[PDB]
Amino acid sequence: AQNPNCNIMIFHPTKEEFNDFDKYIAYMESQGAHRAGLAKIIPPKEWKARETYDNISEILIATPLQQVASGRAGVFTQYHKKKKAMTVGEYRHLANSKKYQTPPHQNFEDLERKYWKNRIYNSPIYGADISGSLFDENTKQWNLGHLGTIQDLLEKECGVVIEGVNTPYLYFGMWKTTFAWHTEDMDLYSINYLHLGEPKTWYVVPPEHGQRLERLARELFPGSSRGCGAFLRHKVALISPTVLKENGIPFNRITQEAGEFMVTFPYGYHAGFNHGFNCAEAINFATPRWIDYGKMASQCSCGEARVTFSMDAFVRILQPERYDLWKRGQD
Ligand SMILES: O=C(O)CNC(=O)C(=O)O
Ligand SMILES: [Mg+2]
Ligand code: NI
Ligand SMILES: [Zn+2]
């Protein structure tokens, strides 16, 4: 079995290997990449997402989110307080202000220490889940706005035609902006490109060990656990690497830099933080290997998780028994 220790693998495709997305994902899996839950893909040196980032300041962040923490430094939840709209130019200024800027640090490890020590004492502002793309339409390889859709994959695999579309989202981050522990909707894959700015640190649990994370989460967030049998779908809970190590949960960490892709694999729990002002783009996708994960994905039916239009068909077709109860949570 390839990659039995579930290490995060890093790939360096040639420009020739960068032509066929599906084939390259399947190659990575042949080498065991999926076992980690997360892989890094460094694009060929000839490749570019677009010519420059000079003209992005007028993108609107219609609902910036202030991420307010509660709990203790290594075990906390965050809630998202909606703030007034601002442009990317305004947001970049805000991220760079004395109140919100990255502190002096030695290296990524020192910054990671400072994040876990101090995150809860600040409330950074995140521009998340903004429908759109920063890939030039003329970028033909690994353009996250031109991937094959999850609906077409399900049709090709299963023969059922369904409604729904599949489009990318932009994330504008600052120091301490945080993504809570989660898997993707319907345990899909995700791909994330860091277009510009400061890094993003990721933590990931191997898919084969996801239930160990869930068990710990139920212990650490006991009221949330009683409220919902899939409360990690709410995307609000954080657990530090120190805490994971204390409880014997297998995980790995890696820092993504501007110009690099990360792929998360089905049922790979992941969490992370941004080092400073940055812009990422991400999208879910599917492969044939995903189908069985989609059929087994947990679902939130308490009403908190509230997700896209397109998830309806996935639940309806892959999880008909759950559909009724899940839909009640949706409405
Ligand atoms: O970059 C972020 O804030 C969050 N991204 C993801 O969880 C992802 O790409 O799956
Ligand atoms: Mg603009
Ligand atoms: Ni994700
Ligand atoms: Zn729920």
Side-chain angles (χ1 to χ4, degrees), residues 1-47 49-50 52-81 83-214 216-244 246-305 307-327 329-330:
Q2 293 269 230
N3 189 24
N5 282 357
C6 302
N7 295 312
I8 297 169
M9 302 179 69
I10 303 161
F11 295 85
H12 287 87
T14 63
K15 60 186 193 321
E16 296 72 27
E17 285 165 344
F18 218 52
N19 280 319
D20 185 333
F21 183 87
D22 287 353
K23 181 189 193 173
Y24 202 82
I25 298 302
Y27 170 67
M28 293 162 57
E29 298 184 347
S30 78
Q31 305 303 295
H34 58 295
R35 298 196 59 181
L38 184 67
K40 181 178 288 194
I41 305 98
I42 294 173
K45 67 188 182 295
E46 301 87 359
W47 180 91
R50 66 180 301 107
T52 80
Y53 293 87
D54 290 336
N55 299 107
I56 70 172
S57 304
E58 318 302 307
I59 293 169
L60 193 67
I61 308 170
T63 310
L65 306 175
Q66 181 168 54
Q67 303 187 293
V68 179
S70 307
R72 60 185 179 95
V75 181
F76 62 90
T77 60
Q78 52 189 15
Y79 92 85
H80 294 164
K81 180 170 168 163
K83 308 294 276 187
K84 290 191 146 165
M86 77 183 85
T87 64
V88 165
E90 291 168 333
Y91 179 89
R92 179 175 59 232
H93 193 257
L94 184 69
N96 295 332
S97 71
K98 293 187 180 172
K99 180 173 179 61
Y100 290 108
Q101 69 182 217
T102 316
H105 57 286
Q106 294 299 323
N107 52 38
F108 296 166
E109 184 175 336
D110 186 35
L111 195 65
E112 178 187 43
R113 183 189 61 72
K114 289 175 184 289
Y115 174 86
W116 294 103
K117 185 180 161 48
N118 295 316
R119 160 67 185 94
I120 63 171
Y121 302 110
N122 299 87
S123 301
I125 293 166
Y126 205 6
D129 298 313
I130 294 157
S131 294
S133 185
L134 292 174
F135 285 84
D136 187 316
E137 73 183 355
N138 293 325
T139 296
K140 296 319 182 180
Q141 296 171 323
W142 287 55
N143 180 322
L144 300 188
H146 297 170
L147 300 185
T149 69
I150 301 155
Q151 297 77 20
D152 284 339
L153 182 284
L154 183 156
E155 177 184 331
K156 286 183 298 183
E157 294 300 297
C158 296
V160 63
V161 183
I162 53 171
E163 72 291 352
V165 291
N166 180 202
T167 52
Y169 298 88
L170 303 176
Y171 300 82
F172 289 95
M174 67 170 61
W175 169 235
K176 286 172 175 172
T177 55
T178 300
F179 53 111
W181 283 104
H182 67 284
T183 60
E184 306 304 304
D185 293 338
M186 219 72 185
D187 297 345
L188 285 155
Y189 295 71
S190 65
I191 183 164
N192 182 300
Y193 183 65
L194 191 54
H195 279 281
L196 61 97
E198 305 311 315
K200 187 186 302 283
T201 292
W202 297 70
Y203 302 92
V204 58
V205 175
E208 69 198 65
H209 302 304
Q211 296 89 353
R212 301 186 187 217
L213 185 67
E214 295 174 351
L216 177 63
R218 288 194 304 271
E219 295 165 0
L220 296 178
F221 302 98
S224 299
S225 184
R226 284 188 289 275
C228 178
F231 72 95
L232 295 174
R233 298 277 174 213
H234 310 167
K235 309 196 304 190
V236 298
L238 277 301
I239 306 164
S240 74
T242 291
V243 177
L244 292 173
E246 283 173 344
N247 287 278
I249 310 301
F251 74 96
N252 282 298
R253 74 193 87 190
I254 194 170
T255 300
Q256 174 193 26
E257 299 185 77
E260 307 178 336
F261 289 91
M262 307 294 298
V263 166
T264 80
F265 292 88
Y267 195 63
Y269 275 104
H270 55 282
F273 64 91
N274 295 305
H275 291 204
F277 173 72
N278 65 16
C279 174
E281 180 168 344
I283 197 176
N284 297 115
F285 71 93
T287 70
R289 192 175 70 79
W290 167 68
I291 293 284
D292 284 341
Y293 288 91
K295 296 175 176 163
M296 301 175 308
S298 67
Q299 303 296 353
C300 166
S301 306
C302 87
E304 284 298 307
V307 310
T308 187
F309 178 99
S310 311
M311 235 198 87
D312 195 277
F314 309 150
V315 181
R316 192 171 74 246
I317 298 307
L318 299 182
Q319 307 186 306
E321 186 271 326
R322 289 187 175 161
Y323 185 62
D324 293 327
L325 184 70
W326 169 82
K327 197 164 37 63
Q330 242 29 22

